[PDB]
C-alpha cells in the first residue's frame, strides 16, 4: 500500500498514476485533497 | 432569516421589531468573472 523509493501506481477514486513516494515539505490545508507542481503535475497526495 | 432574544412569535408582526444592539449586513451578487491568484513559497493565497 504505502511504499517509498519504489515507484508504483496509485488509484484514489481514479487518479491512477506512476510515482516514487518521498517525505515532503508540503503543508496541506486540512480541506485539500492534493497538490501540484509547475505546469499542473501531481506533486503530492494525502491518504484519505 | 432573523430572530431576537425574548421575541414573541405571532401570525402577524408589526414593523417596530425588537430592541437590540447595532449591527450591519451586506449583500452582493456573484457573476462569472476571471481571477489571477498568486501563491507564495509557503503555499497560501496572497494577492487576487
Amino acid at each position: 500500500n504505502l511504499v517509498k523509493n519504489k515507484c508504483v501506481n496509485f488509484n484514489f477514486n481514479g487518479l491512477k498514476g506512476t510515482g516514487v513516494l518521498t517525505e515532503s515539505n508540503k503543508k496541506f490545508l486540512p480541506f485539500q485533497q492534493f497538490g501540484r507542481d509547475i505546469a499542473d503535475t501531481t506533486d503530492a497526495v494525502r491518504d484519505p | 432569516l432573523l430572530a431576537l432574544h425574548r421575541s414573541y412569535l405571532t401570525p402577524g408582526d408589526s414593523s417596530s421589531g425588537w430592541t437590540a444592539g447595532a449591527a450591519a449586513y451586506y449583500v452582493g451578487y456573484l457573476q462569472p468573472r476571471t481571477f489571477l491568484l498568486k501563491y507564495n513559497e509557503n503555499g497560501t493565497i496572497t494577492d487576487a
Binding site: 480541506f31 485539500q32 492534493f34 497538490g35 501540484r36 | 493565497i45 487576487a48
Partner: peptide, 17 residues
C-alpha cells in the same frame, strides 16, 4: 447607504495546495 466592496469574497475554486 452605498459602499464600494473591496477585495472580499475570494475563495479557493479547486482546493489544491
Amino acid at each position: 447607504a452605498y459602499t464600494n466592496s473591496f477585495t472580499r469574497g475570494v475563495y479557493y475554486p479547486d482546493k489544491v495546495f
